[PDB]
Amino acid sequence: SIRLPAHLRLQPIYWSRDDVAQWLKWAENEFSLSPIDSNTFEMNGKALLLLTKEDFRYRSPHSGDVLYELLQHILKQRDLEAEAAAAEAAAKA
């Protein structure tokens, strides 16, 4: 299972630049990746989401694909939570 730090459990589009940086530090240790420099992703989450897998690979040759697929997994689980809260809000109202 993937358990994010509780402060990062928001949809990545709302991630600050700092949130992005904390995501990388967490991912590095969680996935035993080669050290990721702090300034490889100088952007907020809504910028991060515009990047392609190729972009991740150019920025992080060692871990880019892992970081990209991690993001896809995060996006997926948030999307599910969004439609679980959506179906229930319509169920009450």
Site residues (CB under 8 A) for a copy of itself? Answer: 1-2, 30-34, 62-63, 65-66, 69-70, 73, 77
- Sign of the dihedral defined by the CA atoms of residues 5, 26, 44, 19, in that order: positive
Which of 42/81 has CB closer to a copy of itself?
81
Which of 16/72 has CB closer to a copy of itself?
72
Helices (runs of H) and strands (runs of E) counted in the chain: 4, 0
Q: Quote the crossing angle between the two packed helices 64-92 and 17-30, to the nearest 10°.
A: 120
Which of 18/35 has CB closer to a copy of itself?
35
To the nearest whole angstrom, how small is the minimum distance from the Cβ of residue 53 to a copy of itself?
A: 8
